[PDB]
Amino acid sequence: MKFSVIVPTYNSEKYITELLNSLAKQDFPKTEFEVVVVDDCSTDQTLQIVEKYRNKLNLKVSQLETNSGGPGKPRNVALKQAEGEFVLFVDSDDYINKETLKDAAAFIDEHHSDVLLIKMKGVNGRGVPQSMFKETAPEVTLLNSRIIYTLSPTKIYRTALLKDNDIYFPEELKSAEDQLFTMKAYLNANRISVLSDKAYYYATKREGEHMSSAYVSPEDFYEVMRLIAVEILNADLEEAHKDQILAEFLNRHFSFSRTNGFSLKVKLEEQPQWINALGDFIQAVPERVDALVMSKLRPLLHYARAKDIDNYRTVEESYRQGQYYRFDIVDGKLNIQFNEGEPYFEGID
Ligand SMILES: CC(=O)N[C@H]1[C@@H](OP(=O)(O)OP(=O)(O)OC[C@H]2O[C@@H](n3ccc(=O)[nH]c3=O)[C@H](O)[C@@H]2O)O[C@H](CO)[C@@H](O)[C@@H]1O
């Protein structure tokens, strides 16, 4: 069997039909893929809707006896049941192009990808990464492409890549669980490819809670970030490349995650919890890596590593206001001292 399409469900009755219709409309043999649905203890009619496709799809259904607290555990249960040569993770409120499995099977057959990124499209307002999907590419790397800016699991992965290297989702975690999973898959794959010939993965914005907006404590969130830093630094790769991958991950994280601006947005009285958790993550990053990140991040790494919220916050407010304690302009960039007696940080733009 070529593919296992893995679908975690949770009270998905209002939309799960759109996904299952897109799976049944695949212009790809139904004998060559299976749909592995693991229901995270829904209380609605999700499962009765899924069972209407039993004779239409190669279908595997099971249900956890209690809600696991996120997508991770149902996808892990499904991954173990999966028999396809490759897996594709699709969320219950999304759907896929009818040529997706055909196009991906044809592309994998020629290029032997271990991880295949497939171009996504936002539906009614949903934002989706696009910077890595401007071109189809048989071979890309963590350092010569923007794949690190997309860590969602809505990609195709060789099943043996995941299982031979023991790559699973963290469980009982509302969100960011995918970042470690996909970074592990990136770090272990012999070849990563990008298929951009059409819109393959449609990501919707329905309502009710979306996981990636549910509460996760700073402690749980930044533990996944620390594990990622540990994972990179332990990969079987040359030392300089590992540092460079960690730096790129840090550029992404400080630009796009909840870390960005947290000292401006989080209630003052909650910020010591944030800097203690963020600092535990930055303390796993060797200081030599700071020289490789975007220069504007170097003071944030500095004060995070010292768990110094007052100076971290001064940096963020200085950026936001454009008011600095002292600074020089050298080569069109800023050399900034953010507070009396503190270091100057150079090259900021
Ligand atoms: C970036 C992207 O394109 N999609 C990700 C985004 O989607 P998103 O924020 O939309 O998260 P969702 O609410 O759709 O949950 C994702 C999937 O997990 C299932 N679910 C949800 C709650 C639960 O307790 N048990 C359960 O199985 C949903 O039915 C759904 O199939 O944030 C999630 C949390 O990191 C990721 O896993 C999604 O893949």
Residue numbers in the entry: 1 to 349
How do the authors describe this structure?
In this article we describe the crystal structure of TarS, an enzyme responsible for the glycosylation of wall teichoic acid polymers of the S. aureus cell wall, a process that has been shown to be specifically responsible for methicillin resistance in MRSA. TarS possesses a catalytic domain with a canonical GTA fold (one of two distinct A/B folds characteristic of nucleotide-sugar dependent glycosyltransferases) consisting of two closely associated α/β/α sandwich Rossmann motifs that abut and form a continuous central β-sheet. TarS possesses a D(91)XDD motif with aspartates coordinating a metal cation, a feature that is typical of the GTA superfamily. Altogether, TarS features a novel architecture with closely-associated trimerization domains connected by a linker region to three protruding catalytic domains that face away from each other.
Brief soaking of the TarS1-349 crystals with UDP-GlcNAc resulted in an enzyme-donor complex with UDP-GlcNAc trapped in the active site as evidenced by the ligand mFo-dFc simulated annealing omit electron density. Our analysis of the enzymatic mechanism of TarS was facilitated by the capture of various TarS1-349 structures encapsulating the catalytic domain in complex with metal and substrates. These include the native structure with bound Mn2+ (free enzyme), the UDP-GlcNAc bound structure in the presence and absence of Mn2+ (the binary Michaelis complex), and the UDP bound structure with Mn2+ (product complex). The first loop, designated as the catalytic site (CS) loop, contains the putative base catalyst D178 and moves towards the catalytic center in the presence of the intact UDP-GlcNAc donor substrate. The second loop, designated as the substrate access (SA) loop, is ordered only in the presence of UDP-GlcNAc and sterically occludes an otherwise open channel leading into the active site in the absence of the intact donor. Notably the side chain carboxylate oxygen of E177, located in the SA loop, moves into position to form hydrogen bonds with the C4 and C6 GlcNAc hydroxyls, the side chain imidazole of H210 and hydroxyl of S212, located in the CS loop, form stabilizing interactions with the O1B and O2B phosphates when ordered upon UDP-GlcNAc binding, and the uracil ring of UDP-GlcNAc is stabilized by offset π-π interactions with the Y10 phenol side chain. Interestingly, no stabilizing interactions are observed with the N-acetyl group of GlcNAc, such that specificity may extend to similar sugars and may be of interest for inhibitor design. UDP-GlcNAc itself is furthermore observed to assume a “tucked under” conformation (as common in other glycosyltransferases), where the GlcNAc sugar is tucked below the plane of the UDP diphosphates, allowing exposure of the scissile bond to nucleophilic attack. The catalytic domain of TarS reveals interesting structural features, such as a CS loop that positions towards the catalytic center and a SA loop that becomes ordered upon donor substrate binding.
